[PDB]
């Protein structure tokens, strides 16, 4: 009767496929690079 546990242990390769079966159903998007760090200032030259 312990066959179910040896089974669930054994046939644990196929799971992998299933996961990407989710992925093939899944949407995917990328996120462009962000520019970190502070940024320098710039005012205006003496305007006459």
């Amino acid at each position: 009767a312990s066959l179910i546990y040896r089974q669930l242990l054994t046939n644990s390769y196929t799971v992998d496929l299933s996961d990407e079966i989710q992925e093939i159903g899944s949407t995917k998007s990328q996120n462009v690079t962000i520019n970190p760090g502070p940024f320098a200032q710039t005012g205006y030259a003496p305007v006459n």
């Binding site: 990328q30 996120n31 462009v32 690079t33 962000i34 520019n35 710039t42």
Partner: protein, 48 residues
């Protein structure tokens, strides 16, 4: 100096013939152009 005239001490280039029939004035000189370009250096792009 304008021949057959009554006015003395006249200056300034004329509208009569500023080129004397000759060619354009040529000048070789440098020029600096300091400006705030818009330019996304490397970012806002796929990180892959």
């Amino acid at each position: 100096k304008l021949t057959r005239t009554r006015l003395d001490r006249l200056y300034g280039l004329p509208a009569a013939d500023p080129n004397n029939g000759k060619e354009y004035y040529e000048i070789a000189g440098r020029f600096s152009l300091i400006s705030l370009v818009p330019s996304n250096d490397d970012y806002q792009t796929p990180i892959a």
